[PDB]
Design a protein around this nucleic acid. Sequence first.
RNA 1: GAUGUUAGGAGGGCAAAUCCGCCGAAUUUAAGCAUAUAAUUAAGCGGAAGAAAAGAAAAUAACUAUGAUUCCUUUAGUAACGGCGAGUGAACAAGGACCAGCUCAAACGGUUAAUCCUUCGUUUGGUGCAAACCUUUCGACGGAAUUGUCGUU
RNA 2: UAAAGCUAAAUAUAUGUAGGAGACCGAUAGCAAACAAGUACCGUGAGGGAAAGAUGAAAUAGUACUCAGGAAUGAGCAAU
RNA 3: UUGUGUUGAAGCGAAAUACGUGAGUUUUCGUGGAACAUCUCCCUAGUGCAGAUCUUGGUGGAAGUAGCAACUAUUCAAAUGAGAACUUUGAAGACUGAAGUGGAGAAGGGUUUCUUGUCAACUGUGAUUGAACAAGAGUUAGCCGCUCCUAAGGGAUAGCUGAAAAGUGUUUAAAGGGGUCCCCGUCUCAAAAGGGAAACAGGUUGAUAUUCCUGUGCCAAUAGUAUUAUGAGUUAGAUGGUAACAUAUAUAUAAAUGAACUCCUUUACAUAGGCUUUACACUCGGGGUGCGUUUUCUUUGCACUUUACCU
RNA 4: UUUGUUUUGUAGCAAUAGUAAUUCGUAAUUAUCCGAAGUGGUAAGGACUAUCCUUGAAAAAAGGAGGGAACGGCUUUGUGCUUUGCUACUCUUAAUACUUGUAUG
RNA 5: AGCACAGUCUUAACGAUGGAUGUCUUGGUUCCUACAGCGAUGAAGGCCGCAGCAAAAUGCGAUACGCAAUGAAAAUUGCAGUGACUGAAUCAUCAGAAUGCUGAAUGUAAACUACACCAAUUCCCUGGGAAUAGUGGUACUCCUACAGAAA
Lengths: 89, 93, 103, 119, 43
Amino acid sequence: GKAGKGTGSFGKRNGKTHFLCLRCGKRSYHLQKKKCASCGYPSAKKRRFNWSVKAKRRNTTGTGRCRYIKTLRRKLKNKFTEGSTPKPK
Amino acid sequence: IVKSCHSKTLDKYGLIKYPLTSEKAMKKIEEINTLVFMCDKRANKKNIKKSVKNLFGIECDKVNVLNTLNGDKKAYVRLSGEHDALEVANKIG
Amino acid sequence: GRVIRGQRKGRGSIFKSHNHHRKGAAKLRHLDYCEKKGYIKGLVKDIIHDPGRGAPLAKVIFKRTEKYGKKEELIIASEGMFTGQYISCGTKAPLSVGNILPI
Amino acid sequence: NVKAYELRTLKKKELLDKLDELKKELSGLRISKALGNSAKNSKIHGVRKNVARVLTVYNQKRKMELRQLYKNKKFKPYNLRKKLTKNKRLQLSPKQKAAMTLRQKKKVQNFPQRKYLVV
Amino acid sequence: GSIKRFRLKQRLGKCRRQNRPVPHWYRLKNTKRRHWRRTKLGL
RNA sequence: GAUGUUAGGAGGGCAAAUCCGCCGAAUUUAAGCAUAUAAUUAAGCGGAAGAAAAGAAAAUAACUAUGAUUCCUUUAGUAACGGCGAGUGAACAAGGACCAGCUCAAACGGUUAAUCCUUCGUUUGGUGCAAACCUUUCGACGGAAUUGUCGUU
RNA sequence: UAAAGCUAAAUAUAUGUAGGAGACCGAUAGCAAACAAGUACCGUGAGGGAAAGAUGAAAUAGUACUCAGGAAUGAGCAAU
RNA sequence: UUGUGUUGAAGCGAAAUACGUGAGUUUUCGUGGAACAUCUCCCUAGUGCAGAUCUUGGUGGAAGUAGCAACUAUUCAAAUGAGAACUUUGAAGACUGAAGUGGAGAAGGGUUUCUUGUCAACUGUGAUUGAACAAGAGUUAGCCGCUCCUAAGGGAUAGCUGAAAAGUGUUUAAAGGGGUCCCCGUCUCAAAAGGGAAACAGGUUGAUAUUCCUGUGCCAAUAGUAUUAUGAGUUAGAUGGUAACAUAUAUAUAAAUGAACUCCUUUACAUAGGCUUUACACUCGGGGUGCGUUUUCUUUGCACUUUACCU
RNA sequence: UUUGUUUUGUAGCAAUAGUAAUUCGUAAUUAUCCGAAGUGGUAAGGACUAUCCUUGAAAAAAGGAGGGAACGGCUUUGUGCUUUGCUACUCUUAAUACUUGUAUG
RNA sequence: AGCACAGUCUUAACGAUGGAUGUCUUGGUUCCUACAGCGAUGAAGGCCGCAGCAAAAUGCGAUACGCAAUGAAAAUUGCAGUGACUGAAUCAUCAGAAUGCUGAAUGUAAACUACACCAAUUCCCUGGGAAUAGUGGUACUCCUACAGAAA
């Protein structure tokens, strides 16, 4: 009728289906069924699929900071023994 | 597990960072003698209250807390009739 | 074609029983030594309407014999029983309207 | 402007006293900073790096003061054991990997592989 | 709305803070500016 | 058996190009289409390494015989499979790369479980300023094991 | 000589990292992205996804001064 | 192989008594400011555009054209300003009109709020305005809400299926509390309109207020001893009323014992109809405090007089 | 020790806060604040009547009860028990001050 | 001081719009070579922070565009201020120290900065003074030992 198929019913678009999803930070956490559409946060796995190489590539390893493995890199060349220090002057 | 570093729990040197110098921070002191200071977001009412009777000898009728949009907390403190809140402007500045 | 209306009933999404205001399942007293070898009399305190069914229910209080206490049993009321009457259940219960007897 | 070795060894209680009061002095700067003045602003970087310099030694200092209590003893805490990768930690030790049963041990030990030369 | 969660309010504050221009002294040596009415930050 | 805010430990998740299991299409071709083909593929689920998997004949051959596995050249678009239509399709020998082989399952120690693990102490010396590490062995204690470990091939 | 087990080499690597090259492309090309690119932005969501390189040797030569204009600007007998 | 380039290469614009038949080739002038050919012969390919409702980008005639049409409506003077139909002030004429472009409202938005400054773009006319731009500032709770409870229901546990992924959730709970051995008993989430500890008034800021200030309260909580009192009951606990009923006015009316175990009540509930009470709302005339037509009438037209939570 | 007749009070907050008119240095005091009622517009309560092949949530939390495990003290005997002398006693509300973390939010 | 009609079309010169062409290239692409995993000792990923003036990107983690140590070796500079006249300014290396909230996330939860339980915890000197509403531990399954209960 007046809240018709298009513009009229577009005025009823208040209240959201998804929210922030603390695991991903994307506005894709379904609120009623409490599960992220992007990664399925409550489940332990990450919810990737091989039919989306774009989706795989935009959240693969290395797209973030790599706080630990970046430091762990360039260590196998040194082969330093843990606890060792350079010789003092 | 043994932690070797000293604790990172925030003492007042880290809870309370600075006071305000806003016109609102001064006008209520001028009129009805209520004071304004600023502190860290992780502090609580009595963590802040500990500063006022820890660094200073001024009675605290109450401490009031507020969470600003900039990521800090604004604290308000009061006094009682025993102490005037006028020299609490001259000494502090 | 598509799944028909009668076929969608077994899924039980919107075809589950509207039972929000039901007062409880109407069950006889569980078989006990007292009921197996004689009368045990419970007092029908109240007669309620169960919204789902058309037959009124009887709230019968039985004093438990294994402990101190009373027990509430919801029994479909026969026509003629009234609040405050004593209802005998068991092998040696007299044959009267409302009593629970072995067949 | 304090430096490394002038506070590398000084008494811990005096360290704590000066550290406690210098932050109050920092907030005293902050009074004027929130006020119309900003004339003392550039030294806070130096003070902040002196704090880290004193503290990279003070955390190490509490580190010796606490580790000399628990040195060695085979039952090191979680942090004190070696921090190799998980695979390396769970790997068989070289002794266990080269462990050799008595049969083939008496085989090779008595009858080794050894060099020669063909003319 | 007036009533909001702590994380939501903190994110709103961060998005407000990220909306200021480049410092003048730095420019003397930004593209990601939103208007509240033009582009919604989707939270 | 149950139970441990008992002591000591492991698994979980990410990441996949190569690799190992399962599950599993249809588009397509057949000038239609149903077996067939696409394809033992794509998608889906699970599991590892620097490689994985395979691997030491219940193997070929039919010869004057070869000798674990893998890979390359070839056998060979061949033998064969198939509305014998469209299409599909190895193996042996031969030439090379590489090339290491081994142990559990029964006997005997039964005039001595001879085996294994846990814990706690001493020390055989050492590379390192240090941190740590490599070696070190008298043990003792507590167990596991006879419903079978190792010595023995 | 089945119905138990281990095993290094030759083999593969559209991944990550680090090197070296090319009868390759030369900003509508080459990766989507030579740049603040899986960024801005769109979709409730799964997802979709750009545009955009070049002063000059030197801005440690980036336009001083004057005139007219409210200013933008313009002009010069002025200026790098 | 062997050439041209700062004494100006490539490219581009215009051209040529130029050559070819033609694709083209070669020259001149201007611009350009750094590379460019090789026809000596061959090698190679992402190698030649007018079209594909071709792809991307740019630009036309249409054309100063269609059009800038809901919401009755504006006018005079002044200020600011370079500039005023649409900024501000004063006067007027009107509108919204009790179901309001009024106050508070949730969802959604997220600084749009406030002050100051300001006009490159935007504010489809103007603009000095602005929800635009810039710099600062602004959101104060024991009592308002969330937080707690449970509902429709969601997730999970044990199991049981399934290669797993997942499905279902007591399908042989060896599963947390109470009191002092027994009794009871899946966990967790789901309501900012359901249930629910307790606040009102006045004032205050450029921007917050039942949150700040003044005063007055209320609710929940509060570990072991020596003092006090009050009221009671007592040398293990009252009162009358023929009755219903009621029964402690100290700061406050507290002062009439109590385990395990158990049984109730409150929370706690639909619709319709009228009757009634009270508060608020509105209104009426003569008392206390101001404006006015009156060529003509006037005790004349009207206008300002309160009391929260707390007994 | 009661009943009646007269005086105070906007029944007790309460006016003094708030609001309002005329003067008055630019800061104030002034005086009123009254008798009453009438309509039923909106809320809530109350006692009812009617309707249902429709009977119109739960729990947290709180309360009441039945029952009678335990109830006056000092010191003294032996082993919570009999016992010997004296009998003043015990709680409820409010706290006062020393002790545990600092004992409100 | 004067003259051209206007419009439309054509040509040339100079401009406007536009960003082609040429020349540039700290980029891409392909091939070859070599090494190869990380994680309950808390990974990848996500948030939140950190600079004197500081938005993004980059870097980092309450020691927060960097600490210590080692090699080179004296500036940082947009202003400020800080630096030797070499553990000092800046690079490089990076082994020591530190590494917020999360996330397999693992005390219960979760559009909550909500709620538990157990050691009340931690710091000072080598037994006396303080901070305090404030630290660690507590998932599920399984393995080896151990335990006190049971038929």
